[PDB]
Design a protein around this ligand. Structure first.
Ligand SMILES: NC[C@H]1CN(c2c(-c3ccccc3)cnc3[nH]ncc23)CCO1
Length: 248
């Protein structure tokens, strides 16, 4: 029943049980939050941060603790990481995302800061503060609110009033794959006023970050970072991609 607040992790603190010594993370928010909890209550997956509970004292959320830390700290700047680790993390990221979309939830802010690692380096999707329901009673609702973080965000979100939820999460996963294999983000935002994004749209892959990416992962990135959300590859199809299925 009693937890000691060892240290601050992010506010979020690492908590250790007085009797069992089990570790958890506690999100402390003083008064979005009601929905965060609502959504967390529906989530049960090995690639999503576990929700233990909450107490309405200022509010306390009891969330799985990931001693691995965040994925960003596994990416060497300007270099990335070994391709085999990138793939494994992407496999797990896709498992996490398939699950969420499966029960009609979109994270809306997928980035390495919200991808955590446990002790076996398992990836866990984290922070459903911006998440929302996009399918309910087998009915899809298009989104119209601008959420996320500019470098990870899909283009349609900047130029369209309404958009489907799923392809937006897929784009952001591609940007994450890019960060993992090149140690840099390709652009500040997916807009035409952005030189780096114009270049990608023109297939200038001899520039960074694309120069640093092997041809197989890059062909997949060509399928994910497609401006038209309707032409953008879908997850079931990512699951069939050559690089995705390449032994490494
Ligand atoms: N990447 C920053 C993140 C780190 N963080 C967590 C961390 C954590 C702990 C140390 C370093 C980075 C992240 C581990 N498990 C967690 N579960 N829920 C949150 C969380 C809390 C939010 O800030």
């Amino acid at each position: 029943e009693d937890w000691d607040l060892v240290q601050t992790l992010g506010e979020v603190q690492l908590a250790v049980n007085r009797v069992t010594e089990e570790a958890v993370a506690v999100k402390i928010v003083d008064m979005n939050i009601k929905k965060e909890i609502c959504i967390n209550k529906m989530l049960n997956h090995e690639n999503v941060v576990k929700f233990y509970g909450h107490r309405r004292e200022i509010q306390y959320l009891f969330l799985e603790y990931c001693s691995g830390g965040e994925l960003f700290d596994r990416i060497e700047p300007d270099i990335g990481m070994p391709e085999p680790d990138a793939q494994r993390f992407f496999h797990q990221l896709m498992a996490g995302v398939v699950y969420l979309h499966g029960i009609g939830i979109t994270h809306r802010d997928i980035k390495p800061e919200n991808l955590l690692l446990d002790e076996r380096d398992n990836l866990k999707i984290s922070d459903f503060g911006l998440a929302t329901v996009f399918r309910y009673n087998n009915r899809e609702r298009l989104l119209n609110k601008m959420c996320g973080t500019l470098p990870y965000v899909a283009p349609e979100l900047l130029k369209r009033r309404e958009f489907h939820a799923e392809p937006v999460d897929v784009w952001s996963c591609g940007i994450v794959l890019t960060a993992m294999l090149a140690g840099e983000l390709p652009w500040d935002q997916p807009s035409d006023s952005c030189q780096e994004y114009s270049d990608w749209k023109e297939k200038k892959t001899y520039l960074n970050p694309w120069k640093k990416i092997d041809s197989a992962p890059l062909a997949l990135l060509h399928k994910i970072l497609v401006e038209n959300p309707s032409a953008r590859i879908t997850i079931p199809d990512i699951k069939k991609d050559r690089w995705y299925n390449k032994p490494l």
